Amino acid sequence: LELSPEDKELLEYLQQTKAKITVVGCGGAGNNTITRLKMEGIEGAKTVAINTDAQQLIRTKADKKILIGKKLTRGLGAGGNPKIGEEAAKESAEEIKAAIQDSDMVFITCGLGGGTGTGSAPVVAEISKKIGALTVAVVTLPFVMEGKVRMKNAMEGLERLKQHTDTLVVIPNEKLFEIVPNMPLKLAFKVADEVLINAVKGLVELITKDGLINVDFADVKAVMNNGGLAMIGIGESDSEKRAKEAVSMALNSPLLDVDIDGATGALIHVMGPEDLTLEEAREVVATVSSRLDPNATIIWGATIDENLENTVRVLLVITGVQSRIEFTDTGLKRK
Numbered sequence: 613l614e615l616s617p618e619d620k621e622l623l624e625y626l627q628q629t630k631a632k633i634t635v636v637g638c639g640g641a642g643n644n645t646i647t648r649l650k651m652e653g654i655e656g657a658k659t660v661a662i663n664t665d666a667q668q669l670i671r672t673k674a675d676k677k678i679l680i681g682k683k684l685t686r687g688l689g690a691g692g693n694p695k696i697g698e699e700a701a702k703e704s705a706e707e708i709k710a711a712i713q714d715s716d717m718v719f720i721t722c723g724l725g726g727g728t729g730t731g732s733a734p735v736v737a738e739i740s741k742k743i744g745a746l747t748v749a750v751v752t753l754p755f756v757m758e759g760k761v762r763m764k765n766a767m768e769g770l771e772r773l774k775q776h777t778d779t780l781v782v783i784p785n786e787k788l789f790e791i792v793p794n795m796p797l798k799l800a801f802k803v804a805d806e807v808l809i810n811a812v813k814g815l816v817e818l819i820t821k822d823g824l825i826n827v828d829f830a831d832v833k834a835v836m837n838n839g840g841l842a843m844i845g846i847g848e849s850d851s852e853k854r855a856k857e858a859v860s861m862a863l864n865s866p867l868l869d870v871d872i873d874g875a876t877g878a879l880i881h882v883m884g885p886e887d888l889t890l891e892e893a894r895e896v897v898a899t900v901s902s903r904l905d906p907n908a909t910i911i912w913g914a915t916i917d918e919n920l921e922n923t924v925r926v927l928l929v930i931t932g933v934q935s936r937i938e939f940t941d942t943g944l945k946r947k
């Protein structure tokens with residue numbers, strides 16, 4: 613490429629706004645998330661799948677696969693015991709470290725409540741912190757119908773994650789039943805899949821994807837470095853006032869299971885068809901800004917999704933909500 617000294621300096625500036633990003637999916641649900649991200653083609657991110665279960669791991673699609681606890685469970689799994697998942701991850705700590713080495717940002721994703729995910733996720737998070745990466749977890753809490761043991765295990769895992777994350781994005785699966793009431797559990801998991809994909813892919817591609825408005829990693833780091841506890845809101849609309857309806861739906865999302873007045877920061881990803889305008893994106897941001905505390909630090913981007921024909925989708929990630937939430941054995945309680 614023919615490049616002038618001025619063009620080179622411009623390219624150098626744009627390069628330092630980028631980040632090396634790795635997404636790590638732990639356990640059954642985490643592996644399923646990774647497969648979907650790999651097939652759909654998540655932009656600018658390395659995908660790593662880890663599991664104690666060799667049957668689940670081998671059918672997963674990923675850039676890198678790690679069978680954890682080879683000398684512990686021999687590829688059998690963890691049988692829903694978080695202690696087994698934790699010990700397996702600790703055994704394979706060096707292999708996990710090698711796979712995420714030199715990442716500027718690491719996403720850790722799983723369904724909390726099981727053995728492998730609940731156990732290994734905090735270990736991956738600890739390893740990520742120790743390599744100096746911006747460490748973000750995007751995790752689900754189980755449905756109520758899964759039982760008390762699953763939720764108790766999940767909440768203990770959430771407490772361990774909190775010790776080793778910069779931002780902890782929590783998605784309560786139970787609130788999906790407000791979006792799709794009385795859905796069969798097996799199909800409700802498929803909805804949970806889509807939400808996890810939207811959350812992880814949406815956060816990653818806010819930084820990595822070509823957009824109308826691209827985001828500097830420095831600005832993401834400024835919000836997410838001490839993001840604490842975070843929750844998401846998703847909205848979509850294809851009407852005449854698509855942007856207004858999408859942001860309204862996002863702000864009123866059941867997944868935002870918190871008083872949003874306690875928020876100290878926010879990430880906004882506006883997604884639309886080829887006809888998406890800056891004016892539409894600005895309308896979304898202005899609506900969020902007016903609703904939140906005036907002192908909240910808001911970072912936003914806008915990208916074109918080719919799969920969308922007439923629909924604008926808004927992903928909202930609200931940070932610093934730990935002051936309005938209490939961690940209990942039965943789940944998240946509003947304070």
Ligand SMILES: Nc1nc2c(ncn2[C@@H]2O[C@H](COP(=O)(O)OP(=O)(O)O)[C@@H](O)[C@H]2O)c(=O)[nH]1
Pocket residue numbers: 638639640641642644690691692722723724725726727728729730752753754755758762785801802804805808
């Ligand atoms: N999105 C999604 N979540 C799931 C699925 N299966 C289970 N989960 C959730 O993830 C939690 C842990 O399940 P799983 O990943 O299979 O356990 P693990 O392999 O031992 O970590 C469960 O308590 C469920 O709430 C699935 O197919 N999709």
